[PDB]
Amino acid sequence: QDWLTFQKKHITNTRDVDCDNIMSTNLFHCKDKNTFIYSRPEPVKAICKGIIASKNVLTTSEFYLSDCNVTSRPCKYKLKKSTNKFSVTCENQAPVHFVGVG
Numbered sequence: 001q002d003w004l005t006f007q008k009k010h011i012t013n014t015r016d017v018d019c020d021n022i023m024s025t026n027l028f029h030c031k032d033k034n035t036f037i038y039s040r041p042e043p044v045k046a047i048c049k050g051i052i053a054s055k056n057v058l059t060t061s062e063f064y065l066s067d068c069n070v071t072s073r074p075c076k077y078k079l080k081k082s083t084n085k086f087s088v089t090c091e092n093q094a095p096v097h098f099v100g101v102g
Contacts, residue, residue, distance in 0.1 A: 003094035010098050012036040012066060019068030019077035030075035035098060038064040048090035056099055058087045
C-alpha cells in the first residue's frame with residue numbers, strides 16, 4: 001500500500017529467508033506464497049523514480065529473489081532462490097505493491 005509496508009513485505013537482508021518462521025506471522029498469515037527481494041532498499045526504490053501517478057513498471061535490472069512457496073503441508077514452505085526481473089506498482093516515486101516476477 002505504501003513504501004514502508006512494501007519494505008516489510010518484500011525486502012529481506014538475507015537470501016536465506018526462514019519461511020516457516022516468517023510466513024506464520026500475522027503479516028503473512030500462512031498464505032500460499034510470497035516473494036522477497038534480497039537487496040538494499042535504494043536500488044528497489046530507484047525503480048520508481050519520477051513516476052507520480054500509480055503505474056506498473058517492470059525492472060530494467062535483475063534482482064536476487066527468495067520465494068517462500070507453500071508445500072503440500074499447510075503453512076510449511078520451500079525456499080526457492082532465483083534471479084529475475086519483476087514488476088511493481090509505482091506511486092509517488094516508490095514501489096507500493098509487488099505484482100509479479102519475470
